[PDB]
Amino acid sequence: YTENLKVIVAEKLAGIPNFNEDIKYVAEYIVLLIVNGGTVESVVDELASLFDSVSRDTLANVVQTAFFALEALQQGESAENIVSKIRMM
């Protein structure tokens, strides 16, 4: 599920107004933090230390969506369906 998660995180990032950072890199960094056992708080904390152009509230939304999407994937939800939901929003 790591390759689809990186895509799903990128899709979420792409929808953030005024998001100026390298999306592919931020998505990779997020998935690195999550796959290796981070808590929601520890992942948000780490991202906030790297990117001062993005609010903690926004980072928290992105992180929440990532963990949520991962669980959904594990339960057998399709990555397409998850992407379609993120893009609607």
Numbering used by the authors: 6 to 94
Excerpt from the paper describing this PDB structure:
Nuclear abundant poly(A) RNA-binding protein (Nab2) is an essential multidomain hnRNP that is required for the nuclear export of poly(A) mRNA in S. cerevisiae. The Nab2 protein has a modular structure based on four functional domains:23 a unique N-terminal domain of approximately 100 residues, a glutamine-rich linker, an RGG domain, and a Zn-finger domain. Our studies demonstrate that the N-terminal domain of Nab2 is both necessary and sufficient to mediate interaction with Mlp1. The Nab2 N-terminal domain has a fold based on a five-helix bundle that is analogous to the PWI fold found in SRm160 and other nucleic acid binding proteins, although it does not retain the nucleic acid binding function seen in other PWI domains.
We also obtained P43212 symmetry crystals of the Nab2 N-terminal domain that diffracted past 1.8 Å resolution in-house. After solvent flattening, the electron density enabled residues 6–94 to be built to produce a structural model that had an R-factor of 20.7% (Rfree = 26.4%) and excellent geometry after iterative cycles of refinement and rebuilding. The crystal and solution structures of the N-terminal domain of Nab2 were very similar for helices H1–H4 and superimposed with a Cα rmsd of 1.2 Å. However, the position of helix H5 varied significantly between the two structures as a result of a rigid-body rotation of the order of 25°. This difference in the position of helix H5 could have been the result of crystal packing or might have been a consequence of partial proteolysis as it was only possible to trace the chain in the crystal structure as far as residue 94, whereas in the solution structure, this helix extended to residue 99. Inspection of the solution and crystal structures of the Nab2 N-terminal domain showed the presence of a hydrophobic patch centered on Phe72 and Phe73, suggesting that this region of the surface might represent a putative protein:protein interaction interface. Phe73 in particular was completely exposed on the surface of the protein. Overall, the mutagenesis results are consistent with Phe73 forming a crucial component of the interaction interface between Nab2 and Mlp1 and hydrophobic interactions making an important contribution to the interface.
